[PDB]
Amino acid sequence: MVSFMTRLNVADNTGAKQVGIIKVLGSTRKRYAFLGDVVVVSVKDAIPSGMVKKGQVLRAVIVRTKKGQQRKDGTHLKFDDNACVLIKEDKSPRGTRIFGPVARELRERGYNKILSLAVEVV
Amino acid sequence: KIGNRTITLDPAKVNLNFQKDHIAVKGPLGQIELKLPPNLPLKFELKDNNLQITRNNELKQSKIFHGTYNALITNAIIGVTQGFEKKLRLVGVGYRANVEGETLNLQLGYSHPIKEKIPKGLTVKVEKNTEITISGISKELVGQFATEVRKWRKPEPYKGKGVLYFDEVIVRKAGK
Amino acid sequence: MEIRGIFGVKVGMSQVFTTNNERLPITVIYCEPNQVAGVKTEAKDKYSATLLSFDTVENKKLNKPQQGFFEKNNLKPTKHLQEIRNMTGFEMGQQITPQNLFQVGEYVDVSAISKGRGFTGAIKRWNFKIGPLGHGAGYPHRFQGSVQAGRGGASAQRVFKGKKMSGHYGHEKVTVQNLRIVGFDEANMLVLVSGAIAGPEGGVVLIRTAKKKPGVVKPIELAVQTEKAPE
Amino acid sequence: MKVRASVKPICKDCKIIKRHQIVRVICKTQKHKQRQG
RNA sequence: UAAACGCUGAAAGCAUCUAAGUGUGAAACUAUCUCAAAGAUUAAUCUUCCCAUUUCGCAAGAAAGUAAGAGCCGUCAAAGA
RNA sequence: ACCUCGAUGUCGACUCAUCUCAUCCUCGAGCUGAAGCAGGUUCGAAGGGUUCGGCUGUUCGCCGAUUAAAGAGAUACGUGAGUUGGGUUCAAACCGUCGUGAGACAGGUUGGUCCCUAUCUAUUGUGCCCGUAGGAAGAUUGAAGAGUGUUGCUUCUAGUA
RNA sequence: UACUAAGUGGAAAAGGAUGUGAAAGUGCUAAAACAGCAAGGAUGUUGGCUUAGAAGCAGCCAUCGUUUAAAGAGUGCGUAA
Ligand SMILES: [K+]
Ligand SMILES: [Mg+2]
Ligand SMILES: [Mg+2]
Ligand SMILES: [Mg+2]
Ligand SMILES: [Mg+2]
Ligand SMILES: [Mg+2]
Ligand SMILES: [Mg+2]
Ligand SMILES: [Mg+2]
Ligand SMILES: [Mg+2]
Ligand SMILES: [Mg+2]
Ligand SMILES: [Mg+2]
Ligand SMILES: [Mg+2]
Ligand SMILES: [Mg+2]
Ligand SMILES: [Mg+2]
Ligand SMILES: [Mg+2]
Ligand SMILES: [Mg+2]
Ligand SMILES: [Mg+2]
Ligand SMILES: [Mg+2]
Ligand SMILES: [Mg+2]
Ligand SMILES: [Mg+2]
Ligand SMILES: [Mg+2]
Ligand SMILES: [Mg+2]
Ligand SMILES: [Mg+2]
Ligand SMILES: [Mg+2]
Ligand SMILES: [Mg+2]
Ligand SMILES: [Mg+2]
Ligand SMILES: [Mg+2]
Ligand SMILES: [Mg+2]
Ligand SMILES: [Mg+2]
Ligand SMILES: [Mg+2]
Ligand SMILES: [Mg+2]
Ligand SMILES: [Mg+2]
Ligand SMILES: [Zn+2]
C-alpha cells in the first residue's frame, strides 16, 4: 500500500530511477494506493538521456507492491518492490517498454496498452 | 354580479335535488354531486326553470360564497348538459402518445417510459399522435389531467417543443 | 410484514468456493427444529407475533413454573423461549426448520449478542485519536478528549448527556443485515450463512427475513471439483 | 422572482394581488414577478 | 409540508393558486432501519407455578404450622475492576 | 470602568467536539443578456460532509497537488485540577539605537522549573435497598428516547435532445 | 356598544400594499353607469428634415389638419425600415 511521500521505482524506459508520491488521486483522504491506482508523482532521480527531467510533476499508475493485495479467489499477489509507470492523460504509457512483471488489476481499470507492452502479466 | 345572475335552465332533462348539504344534478351525462359546507350563509329558492340564491347578511364571506357557488352551479349544469373539453397540442421531434386501457403512455424524451392512469369519469382521446383531447363532466378534474400531463414537458420559450395548450401563445426568444 | 424467524447456535466459521470464481467466508449455524409454543393475534392482543421454543433439555433441568407451562401447553420442555414480531401463518405445536422458512440463497439478517469485552477506554470504544507520544508529553496519553462545552455562567458549564467516555463494551445485541444463505444440511440440521456472525462460538443466534431486501434472492451455487485419481 | 422590501408595478400591465397573506406582483413578463412586499 | 407551480373559482360579471373545496412539492419534519426501555410512582399486559392449618382471640391479631422460589458456600467462563 | 488585584492562568498547536445560518458541497425552485455544456442572481433548506503539505510560534497569509466542497461565526477570541511551552513577559549574554550615567526599547537574537490522590454537582458504566399492595419464575406491548443519514467515477440511455 | 383576524395583543425604523371599519366632498347612471364581450378603430402619407432606413411607434421640424361615431404623426409589441 503506497502512501503519501513514498519513494518507488519506475519499471519503464523513461529516465527516472526514483519517484516520490505526492497525492493518492481519486477522493478526499484516500489513505492508500493499491494495484491499479493512479497517483500524482514527482521525478527525483533521473538520467541525462531521459524524456523526463528531475523535478517534473507527473501522473503515474502503480503496477507492483511489496505489501500486496488479495484477489476474490483467495490468491494473495505479493511482489518485492513497489513500482509505477508514467502514464499520459489518455491512460497510455509514456515509455516504450515495461520492465518486469505486472499485476492483473490493470486489466480491470482499462490500461490495455500497459498489458500489451509488458513482459508477462501476473 | 355573479350572485344576482340568472341560472335559467330547461327542465327537459336536468333536475337539481337540494338536500341539506348534498346538491345532486342529473342530466344527459353523469350525475354531479356538490357538497355544501355547514352553516352556509346563502339560501337557494327553486321556482319554475329559475333558481335564485339569496343571502342573509352583508358579510364579506357571505358575498364571496354567493358568487362562488353561483359559478359552481353554472359549471355543474353545463358539464352535466354538455360537458367540458380540453385540447393539448403535444409538439416535438419524437413526441407521441397513445392510450392502452386505462393508462395513457407518452414518450417525450425520457429513458424511463411515462405512463399515466386515467381517473373515473374522464375520457381522453388521441386522434393524431400530436393531439390530445380530454373530455369530461367536471371542469376541475379535466383541468387537473391537462396540467398533470403538461408537467412532464413544459413548453420552452426557445423553440416550440412541449405539451402546449390549444390557442396558447408563448413568448419567443432567440438563442443564437 | 411477513417476517420469518428461526433460532440456532453458531458453531464456527469456514469458507466455500463458488461458481463465478469467488471464495466466500461462511458462518455455520446449528439449527435445532424449533417448536411453536404460542401464537398471539392482532385482534385479540393488539399485535401479532409468534413465540417458539428451542434448545430442548431434560425435565429435571427446568424450573417448576416453566415445566408446568410446558405440560399445560403439551410441548417439549425447552429452556429457551423467545418470540419474533409479525410472524404469522404457523399452527401451535408445529416443528419448524429453516428449510421451510428460507430459500437456498435468499437475503436474511442475523441478530446475536456481541462478544463481551469488559471495561474499555474511550479510544477502543469510540474510535478516538491518541495523543502525541513524543516531542514532550504528559501523564494522560490515551486521553478521552476534552469534555468542555462552556466555562462561565453564560454557557453550559456541564458535561452534555450522552457523552463519549469509557465504559462497558460488548455483550450487547447487534444485527447484521443482508446476509445470503449459502446451503442447507438436513441430516446434520446445519445452516450455512455467508459473512461473519456476531457472538462467541456456541452462543444463540436469530435468523430473520431481511427488512431491507425482503423478497430478494440472489442465486449462489458451489463448485464441483474436477480432480481425478492419481495416474 | 425578485424578493424586495418594497413592491410596485413596473409596467401598466403588472397587477398587485395578495396571496397567502403576502402581497406579490404578477404580470405577463416573468422578469417582473415580485414578492415580500 | 417550506420555497415554487397548480386546477376549479368569486370578493372586484374580466382577471385571479385561495377566501370555501381539491392537488403537486426538498438530504429539512413525523415514521420506516439499529439499540435500550413499565422506578412510565400515570409503576402497564399475558402465561405458568406455590400458598389455602391446629388452638387461644382478635383479625392484612397472636403461639406454634404450612410451599414455589431466592440467597449464603463451592467448581467455573459465552461474563467480568 | 460595573464584577474580579486575601490571584478569573493570557497566543498558537493537539484531543474532543457542540451550537447558529448570513449555505462551500449535496437537495428543491423562480428570473436570466438561460440554444446545449458550463455559468450569474434570488428564494427554501443546518441531515451529513467540509483534504494533505512547503515557509512562519504563529491566527492570518502566499504557494503546490487534489476534492462534490476545501463555508462564515459563537461557545472566558471553547477546551493547561486534559497535553505541549514554539511565542509573549523573570533572572544570563550580545547587536542596532537612546542616555554623561546606572539602565531602556510592540527593535533583533541564543538559553531558560507549567503543581494538585476529585468532596458536591454534571457525565460514562455497573451494583445494593425498597416500591410496583400475596409471593415467585418466564414472555411481552411501548409513553418518553438515543444512534446512523456523506458522496464520487465509468458504462448504457445517446453522440440521442 | 363597537373594532381586530394578525395570537396582533405579547418589541422595533425608512419604505411598500385593492386588509378592514368610520367620516366628510365630488363624477356618471333605469335618457342606462363601470368591467367584460361583439364591431369598427380612418384619409392625405409612409407629412417632412433626419437617419444606410424610420414613413402611426430612432433623434427630430414640430408635436398637423379634414371625413367622421371614433380614431392618436398613435398603444405597445414588432418590422433593417
Ligand atoms: K485582579
Ligand atoms: Mg512532570
Ligand atoms: Mg510518558
Ligand atoms: Mg444567568
Ligand atoms: Mg448556564
Ligand atoms: Mg384561472
Ligand atoms: Mg405530499
Ligand atoms: Mg404517594
Ligand atoms: Mg464613576
Ligand atoms: Mg466577572
Ligand atoms: Mg478567595
Ligand atoms: Mg484559585
Ligand atoms: Mg487553574
Ligand atoms: Mg436562509
Ligand atoms: Mg429524516
Ligand atoms: Mg524539510
Ligand atoms: Mg470576543
Ligand atoms: Mg481561548
Ligand atoms: Mg475558534
Ligand atoms: Mg479584543
Ligand atoms: Mg480547564
Ligand atoms: Mg490549554
Ligand atoms: Mg499538569
Ligand atoms: Mg480549572
Ligand atoms: Mg520559550
Ligand atoms: Mg524548553
Ligand atoms: Mg539582563
Ligand atoms: Mg553614547
Ligand atoms: Mg424519562
Ligand atoms: Mg409578538
Ligand atoms: Mg393599503
Ligand atoms: Mg381605511
Ligand atoms: Zn410587468
Side-chain angles (χ1 to χ4, degrees):
Chain A
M1 340 165 277
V2 152
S3 324
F4 167 58
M5 185 160 342
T6 281
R7 298 252 299 295
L8 77 178
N9 286 344
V10 184
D12 74 32
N13 59 7
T14 68
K17 304 272 154 179
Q18 220 87 354
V19 159
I21 310 280
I22 286 173
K23 175 79 63 168
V24 189
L25 254 59
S27 157
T28 286
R29 295 171 44 195
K30 177 156 188 175
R31 232 175 309 269
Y32 301 106
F34 310 111
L35 297 180
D37 256 348
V38 60
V39 289
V40 153
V41 288
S42 89
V43 186
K44 293 202 134 168
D45 293 23
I47 68 168
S49 41
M51 83 138 273
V52 298
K53 320 266 163 171
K54 182 200 60 82
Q56 303 197 15
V57 187
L58 296 159
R59 278 218 194 176
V61 72
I62 197 172
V63 290
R64 310 201 275 286
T65 36
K66 196 145 136 52
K67 184 73 194 297
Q69 87 152 60
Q70 168 163 359
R71 299 133 92 111
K72 249 319 204 180
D73 51 328
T75 295
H76 178 92
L77 191 34
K78 175 153 164 44
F79 307 90
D80 218 284
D81 61 300
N82 324 81
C84 77
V85 311
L86 270 74
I87 72 199
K88 297 178 48 57
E89 313 70 26
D90 172 20
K91 266 190 170 180
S92 303
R94 285 184 188 261
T96 36
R97 311 140 74 194
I98 272 67
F99 300 137
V102 315
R104 204 167 306 310
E105 282 75 6
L106 300 308
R107 165 108 33 201
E108 320 310 321
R109 284 165 182 117
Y111 295 132
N112 282 312
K113 271 294 304 308
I114 288 204
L115 304 150
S116 40
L117 265 52
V119 152
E120 56 102 8
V121 80
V122 174
Chain B
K1 158 159 256 163
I2 282 45
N4 305 118
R5 91 177 266 242
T6 195
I7 192 97
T8 51
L9 76 169
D10 45 346
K13 284 194 169 189
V14 196
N15 60 7
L16 65 169
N17 302 358
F18 278 11
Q19 272 81 51
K20 287 199 330 212
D21 43 330
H22 191 161
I23 279 179
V25 155
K26 307 178 47 192
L29 291 295
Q31 164 184 189
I32 284 309
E33 142 173 344
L34 274 145
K35 204 202 291 293
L36 291 319
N39 247 29
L40 215 30
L42 60 160
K43 36 201 291 290
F44 313 80
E45 311 186 10
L46 180 123
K47 292 171 186 176
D48 215 28
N49 288 20
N50 309 288
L51 197 84
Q52 293 274 344
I53 318 108
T54 58
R55 52 161 91 81
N56 323 93
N57 42 62
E58 199 39 90
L59 202 74
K60 186 104 183 321
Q61 199 88 264
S62 278
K63 265 174 112 202
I64 218 165
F65 276 161
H66 187 203
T68 281
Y69 267 80
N70 182 284
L72 285 184
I73 291 304
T74 313
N75 279 333
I77 295 170
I78 293 177
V80 152
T81 278
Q82 24 180 282
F84 302 111
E85 73 143 50
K86 274 233 175 270
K87 221 260 211 189
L88 316 175
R89 192 172 199 61
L90 175 168
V91 59
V93 55
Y95 297 179
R96 45 145 37 81
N98 66 355
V99 202
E100 317 271 359
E102 201 85 341
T103 70
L104 162 54
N105 45 354
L106 317 95
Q107 41 256 68
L108 288 318
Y110 294 75
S111 297
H112 65 118
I114 310 82
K115 271 216 276 163
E116 184 65 50
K117 304 261 180 303
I118 311 157
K120 155 150 190 63
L122 277 35
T123 313
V124 47
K125 254 189 61 159
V126 48
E127 307 106 326
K128 309 184 258 177
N129 292 130
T130 63
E131 182 202 9
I132 290 293
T133 86
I134 323 183
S135 321
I137 69 182
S138 205
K139 222 188 185 183
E140 78 293 11
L141 223 69
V142 313
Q144 252 291 2
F145 206 105
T147 196
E148 86 155 289
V149 168
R150 141 154 297 181
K151 82 186 172 178
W152 291 118
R153 274 270 190 267
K154 318 280 285 186
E156 65 167 310
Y158 284 122
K159 304 220 307 201
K161 311 186 58 184
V163 202
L164 268 161
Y165 271 114
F166 206 62
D167 39 332
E168 157 145 308
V169 291
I170 76 87
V171 286
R172 200 72 66 181
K173 310 174 55 166
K176 287 222 183 312
Chain C
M1 274 144 205
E2 193 194 305
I3 285 278
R4 307 239 188 77
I6 200 67
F7 289 93
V9 294
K10 181 182 144 190
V11 311
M13 165 151 320
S14 169
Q15 89 197 357
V16 302
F17 301 86
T18 83
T19 279
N20 82 35
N21 182 347
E22 268 146 20
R23 184 199 54 90
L24 220 74
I26 61 179
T27 310
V28 193
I29 299 149
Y30 178 94
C31 261
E32 268 262 89
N34 281 195
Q35 176 95 251
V36 173
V39 154
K40 264 171 314 299
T41 45
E42 191 98 349
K44 204 259 192 193
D45 183 336
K46 261 312 199 303
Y47 80 114
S48 62
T50 293
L51 166 148
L52 316 95
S53 98
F54 64 100
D55 185 12
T56 88
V57 47
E58 286 126 315
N59 217 349
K60 296 147 60 290
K61 320 225 252 168
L62 252 187
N63 198 348
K64 188 154 292 326
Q66 287 122 11
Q67 70 186 97
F69 154 79
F70 271 112
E71 164 248 311
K72 174 97 172 41
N73 273 66
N74 189 127
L75 295 164
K76 294 164 44 181
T78 58
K79 45 164 203 332
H80 283 358
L81 221 63
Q82 222 195 66
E83 103 190 332
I84 321 100
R85 199 81 189 270
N86 299 106
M87 206 173 148
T88 68
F90 307 113
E91 57 168 16
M92 152 98 72
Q94 153 190 8
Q95 307 260 37
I96 271 168
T97 206
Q99 210 155 225
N100 331 116
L101 292 175
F102 312 115
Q103 290 141 358
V104 182
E106 85 152 29
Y107 287 75
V108 302
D109 62 345
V110 180
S111 313
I113 270 71
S114 300
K115 207 177 264 218
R117 308 210 172 67
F119 205 114
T120 76
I123 307 115
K124 194 135 170 315
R125 197 187 176 191
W126 292 118
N127 275 297
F128 275 166
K129 210 152 177 53
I130 300 182
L133 274 55
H135 285 143
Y139 209 90
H141 283 138
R142 291 180 140 268
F143 181 45
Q144 49 161 35
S146 166
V147 287
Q148 175 108 69
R151 146 191 174 187
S155 293
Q157 269 186 242
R158 54 178 231 274
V159 175
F160 276 134
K161 183 87 84 52
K163 200 70 181 153
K164 289 183 176 181
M165 304 136 87
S166 325
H168 194 270
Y169 180 40
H171 213 72
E172 85 214 307
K173 175 137 109 143
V174 70
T175 286
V176 53
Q177 331 195 269
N178 310 346
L179 290 176
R180 311 200 331 260
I181 294 196
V182 191
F184 289 130
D185 199 338
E186 68 311 318
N188 324 121
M189 51 205 168
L190 212 83
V191 194
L192 271 49
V193 168
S194 100
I197 304 288
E201 283 94 30
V204 78
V205 166
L206 166 62
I207 305 164
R208 233 186 315 114
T209 298
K211 297 152 184 181
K212 296 286 180 74
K213 333 174 156 273
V216 179
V217 48
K218 159 99 71 178
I220 214 76
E221 102 189 351
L222 272 53
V224 201
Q225 303 302 143
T226 88
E227 310 294 309
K228 311 173 180 181
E231 85 284 61
Chain D
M1 183 130 48
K2 299 181 304 211
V3 164
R4 27 201 51 180
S6 73
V7 297
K8 289 173 273 69
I10 278 177
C11 53
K12 57 182 152 43
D13 196 79
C14 296
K15 44 169 71 53
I16 281 137
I17 38 64
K18 197 218 193 63
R19 185 183 293 123
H20 303 316
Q21 333 291 345
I22 293 162
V23 46
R24 338 191 174 226
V25 188
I26 63 184
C27 181
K28 182 195 311 173
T29 304
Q30 314 300 327
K31 230 176 187 176
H32 301 177
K33 299 167 45 179
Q34 301 154 306
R35 213 249 305 168
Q36 204 194 264

